[PDB]
Design a protein around this ligand. Structure first.
Ligand SMILES: Cc1cc2nc3c(=O)[nH]c(=O)nc-3n(C[C@H](O)[C@H](O)[C@H](O)COP(=O)(O)OP(=O)(O)OC[C@H]3O[C@@H](n4cnc5c(N)ncnc54)[C@H](O)[C@@H]3O)c2cc1C
Ligand SMILES: Cc1cc2nc3c(=O)[nH]c(=O)nc-3n(C[C@H](O)[C@H](O)[C@H](O)COP(=O)(O)OP(=O)(O)OC[C@H]3O[C@@H](n4cnc5c(N)ncnc54)[C@H](O)[C@@H]3O)c2cc1C
Lengths: 458, 458
């Protein structure tokens, strides 16, 4: 229960919608993508402008409310909703200005990935983002952000030119390489720790149709497939991106009915470049084993962005255990294959991704993002429906992570699960963490923004 | 030049951006998708809320500025920009609230399709719209709106449940089957004639993966393909959509270099339903001639929405000629095939679409959309780059339209070119045209919204 004059003051400054536990659209506004997170915020504040976030940030500050900030609500830690505090919901701020002469896009802090790519591709432009269209932009970009364009153009933070950000004291700041450049260093990898970002500006690149391929390998050929992949990507051009999603086979018509719901290697690849070059390049790598249900297409980039994932089903409940690898040993290959063979839910994926390329040529200390030079990412992403099966699906992800343990180092802040608050120092490393603390003490000394992979101040 | 006091009164109420002919955002804010129209407005008002629209409408009224409304800027007639007046520019009003429980979407008047179907596909939901993702939702819906889901679920207006609309006197209204139902009839097919729809509400349907195929046929086999298409669609189930676009083959690696830049039939089809049923159904319609550059895939609906068109090139300049057909005789099939062989630009398409289905089971008088009972639509959509070549490409579409004339009737308002103001009555028919003037006399008696397929009051 809140001081009547202070809410009266907040709401006086707010143009958006307030949702209270007793209102209609409360239960749905407070659900987030990770259905295992069931929290009841004291107030959801769906902001509609930079001034509204200013109002919300200050209200929460002297009311003492715990502050959750919501972009697209895809936090695998469930950070975008709180019990008993305030949700600063940016989901209605999803505008995107795109300048065709500038190759520039100014996007609001609540954009969904697909809204951004729709607007940029109106001029055949694009910049790197994640692969699932309904991910929010805010949480992905603030943690680094990678997808199909990353090997050629870098992380999302590698194409960020500025932010407009609301700091914990209510102020509005511009952060670029020429304005508040400590802050601009922290936001490019340091999550929500330093204020609410209400507008990202990106440099955009011209991306026409990309030649794309998706196929399925039996586990029989599991070794030959993954060893071919790790060897090829060691020397592959930036233009080739190639990923492995180990999963139960989706019951799609392009695959024989006999493999349906059997573990497979789903391999997806594309070529950011001339599709004829992609046609030869992709087929050079498509046949490490016998490809089942081969799909080959020249897609607009926006269609590439909307393709993931085969079967297009939205899981209710989630658990992710992820890490980086400097090299994928044949013993690490045998253990990913033995754990894949025991996947139970039809929505679970053991993803093996190769980064590197443009991401690894950016100097390490340029941004807050860690482990640029570790080129493998592995994500044991459990995803199911039935709440009574929670234990066994998280047990699957826990035990795949443990059996890989020492091969793994660091960690992507945006793949952390709710029980991994203590991974923050080891994900960044002592050096980056300790500089991030220096920025935290300066811009958020009270730690008003602590629902995130949080860096305490000092 | 305008009144300092009411300018100041408008500025005071307006929370958006203003763009003057001296502002750095002017040249690009005033360009729309049809490059052929070059118009310099006195003021571009980039609204951010409904009261913002209330202020820009009243200001134009008091000052007598000709009002253009812009949603997505895709007006084939050029209606979203004006010389010397004010643009009410909705492109920043892009937010979409999607309720999973209700299968309901609320979309602001400036949404693009790609943001809309990103928003709904986060819950495996969808409702019909166009086939190109950067088209604005506002103008498309107010004209009816058809796309991949239309034969199964009807027009975009067949799923609209209410609109929030700002009328010429500055008042804000709700129009539905329950509230001002005369107006709710008029906006469903009558364009921007009755005010600025600041919010569209829709019923959504569950649309999982959809089996999809695109392929190309030589004009050698043009006659049998198009006859099989017209014979099959007369009997096809609603779940089968099948469209033909005659064009120059794009230089894509799936096609033999021999066909690049040569006139072909690009056939695209999909099954809204079980993909295993869909594979059998698309496969039964794929071989009326030898299919080349064949792409088959099981896509998330958002990926289907993002696919058109193969090559993904945005044309600078467009001119279109379009009409309906109750029947596609062999004399017309000939005429279509011969004019397609004369296509000179690599972005020009001769579109032959089959509607019908759920579109044609809505009683004619239920909305303002005309010609549900005509299942065929053909659109000669010339699109090029060179401004010194305008006559050539405009000539191609005029003379193709006129070589079909007697087969063509009515005309989709959303496909009219800047010279076709006269076609408003033939497109609606006399009965609908007279009923719409009746509504126009009530809600826009001064014809303040006249930059549309305009319906004069009385
Ligand atoms: C299905 C799925 C696919 C994914 N694919 C990819 C992928 O391809 N690549 C990749 O790199 N990651 C990917 N991710 C991870 C994604 O980057 C993170 O989950 C991200 O944090 C989600 O962003 P969000 O704002 O939508 O989530 P939220 O839960 O709304 O926010 C996450 C965190 O960011 C903070 N935050 C969000 N917006 C702002 C803002 N505007 N200002 C300040 N702080 C903010 C929140 O406070 C919170 O701590 C994926 C996640 C999912 C669930
Ligand atoms: C590449 C392309 C693909 C297309 N594909 C399809 C398709 O598959 N199916 C189909 O049916 N049509 C299709 N169209 C046509 C489309 O429906 C129309 O061009 C439509 O006008 C697009 O709306 P818009 O808001 O983007 O256009 P705008 O230029 O922004 O607006 C067009 C008209 O609508 C009015 N208007 C716009 N928004 C509002 C509003 N909120 N309130 C009141 N009036 C408003 C404007 O004043 C103007 O009169 C396509 C067009 C293009 C260019």
């Amino acid at each position: 229960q809140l001081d009547p004059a202070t809410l009266a003051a907040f709401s006086a400054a707010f143009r958006g919608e307030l949702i209270w536990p007793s209102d209609a659209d409360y239960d749905e506004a407070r659900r987030i993508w990770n259905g295992t997170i069931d929290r009841r915020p004291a107030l959801i504040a769906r902001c509609t402008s930079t001034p509204d976030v200013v109002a919300a940030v200050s209200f929460a500050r002297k009311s003492g409310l715990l502050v959750a900030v919501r972009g697209g609500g895809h936090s695998m830690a469930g950070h975008s909703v709180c019990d008993g505090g305030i949700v600063i919901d940016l989901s209605l701020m999803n505008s995107i200005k795109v300048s065709r002469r500038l190759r520039r896009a100014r996007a609001q802090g609540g954009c969904l990935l697909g809204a951004f790519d729709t607007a940029t591709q109106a001029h055949m432009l694009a910049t790197p983002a994640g692969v699932v269209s309904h991910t929010g932009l805010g949480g992905l970009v603030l943690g680094g952000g990678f997808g199909w364009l990353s090997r050629k153009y870098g992380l999302s933070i590698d194409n960020l030119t500025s932010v407009e950000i609301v700091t914990a004291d209510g102020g509005v700041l511009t952060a670029s390489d020429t304005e508040n450049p400590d802050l601009f260093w922290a936001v490019r990898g340091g999550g929500g720790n330093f204020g609410v970002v209400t507008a990202f500006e990106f440099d955009l690149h011209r991306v026409g149709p990309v030649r794309f391929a998706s196929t399925y390998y039996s586990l029989d050929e599991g070794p030959q497939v993954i060893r071919a992949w790790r060897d090829h990507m060691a020397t592959a051009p930036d233009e080739l991106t190639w990923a492995l999603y180990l999963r139960l086979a989706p019951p799609l018509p392009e695959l024989p009915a006999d493999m349906h719901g059997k573990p497979v290697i789903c391999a997806m690849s594309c070529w950011i470049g001339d599709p004829h070059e992609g046609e030869r390049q992709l087929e050079s790598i498509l046949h490490a084993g016998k490809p089942h249900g081969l799909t080959k297409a020249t897609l607009p980039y926006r269609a590439l962005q909307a393709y993931s994932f085969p079967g297009a089903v939205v899981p209710d409940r989630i658990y992710t255990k992820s890490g980086y690898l400097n090299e994928l040993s044949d013993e690490a290959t045998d253990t990913v294959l033995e754990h894949a063979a025991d996947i139970a839910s039809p929505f679970t994926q053991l993803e093996l991704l190769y980064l590197g390329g443009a991401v690894a040529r950016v100097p390490d200390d340029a941004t807050a993002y860690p482990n640029r030079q570790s080129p493998f990412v592995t994500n044991l992403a459990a995803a199911w429906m039935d709440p009574t099966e929670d234990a066994r699906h998280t047990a699957w992800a826990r035990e795949g992570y443990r059996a890989l343990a020492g091969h793994l180092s660091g960690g992507y802040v945006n793949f952390m699960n709710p029980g991994e608050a203590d991974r923050t120092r080891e994900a960044y490393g002592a050096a980056k963490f300790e500089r991030l603390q220096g920025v935290k003490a300066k811009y958020d000394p009270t730690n008003l923004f602590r629902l995130n992979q949080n860096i305490p101040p000092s």
